[PDB]
With several copies, the nearest count.
Chain A
Amino acid sequence: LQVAYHXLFQXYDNHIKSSC
């Protein structure tokens, strides 16, 4: 869950970073 929470955060961060 912890490693998955860190994974999910990276996914969400990369998503906003890939927008603009």
Chain B
Amino acid sequence: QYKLILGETTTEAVDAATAEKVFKQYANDNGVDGEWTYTKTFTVELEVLGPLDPNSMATYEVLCEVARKLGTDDREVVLFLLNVFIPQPTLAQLIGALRALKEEGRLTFPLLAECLFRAGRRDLLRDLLHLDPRFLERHLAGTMSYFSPYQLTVLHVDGELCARDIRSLIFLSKDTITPQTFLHWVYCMENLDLLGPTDVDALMSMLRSLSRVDLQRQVQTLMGL
């Protein structure tokens, strides 16, 4: 057990020198670079890329409160739409991935709004993001989407497919496997390179073999010639 004062961060080290190395790395990781004083505690005076720090930490509240109130299947939608997708994630997996995107600048507020909109969480737009979904639906009408037509197609198919069809989908997927959801099946096929934004033939092959010809035709309408 070793303590760090900036933000009371703690670690478990074999010796004091290792604890200093771990903490000195955490200093760069955050961006803070102050004078070090090492009892079993270490204190850090300067920063780069108080007020600013409070704002940065406060911004995370929006993402933390959003992720905690997201829920099982919405987690997949959000992670799928934000490229880096994890199959059947947990709070610790999602919170970590969303924070890894925010620190990489890949996540923005208007993107997060459309991300929560496509998820169907208009309740979270109203209550947490303070954005009226009646206005947001009008905003997206005359604005180019942050997500690919393929991304939006897979999301639409996911919504129309029922619990029985997705159970049958897993049974048919055993020929290329295992997935627990349709978005999990998509991820497996994307990794195996059978599905993708360019082809989408594999999605229609499954929908034809699930008797959802209406969904197969919907994918064809959403992709064209």
Chain A residues within CB distance 8 Å of chain B: 2, 5-6, 9-10, 12-14, 16-17
Contact = CB atoms under 8 A, between A and B. Distances in A.
Contacts, number: 25
Interface residues of B, number: 12
Contact of B131 (A6, A14, A16, A17): A6
B147 to A, nearest CB: 13
A13 B139 contact: yes
B144 A9 contact: no
Nearest to A14: B143
Interface string B63-104: 000000000000000000000000000000000000000000
Interface of B: 108-111, 113, 130-132, 135, 139, 143-144
Given A17-B143, A17-B144, A12 B132 contact: no
Given A5-B130, A6-B131, A6-B132, A16 B108 contact: yes
